[PDB]
Copies of this chain bind each other. A is one copy, B any other.
Amino acid sequence: GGELSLVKKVVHSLVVSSPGKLTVEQLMRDYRSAAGCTLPYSKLGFKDAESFLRSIPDTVTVTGHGQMAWITAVA
């Protein structure tokens, strides 16, 4: 019910709805357009998008580092 839980569901929907595997920068752009606001990693306490995404392994998997790191839905 909390905001973290709701953000995790939006991220998951965006990853699953992308046919091809996503980069951090593409997911970032997808969230900004679909929500009208930047992926809220800072509001949730993290220094950058990759740090937040690495904090939710129950939702996504991060492979690599930086803008071009891969983001894939949890198995």
Contact = CB atoms under 8 A, between A and B. Distances in A.
Given A35-B37, A36-B40, A36-B43, A10 B17 contact: no
Contacts of A38: 36-37
Interface residues of A, number: 18
A49 interface: no
A37 to B, nearest CB: 4
Contacts of A5: 6, 9
Quick one: copies of this chain in the complex?
2
Contacts of A53: none
B2 A6 contact: yes
B17 A9 contact: no
Interface string A1-28: 1110111011001100100000000000
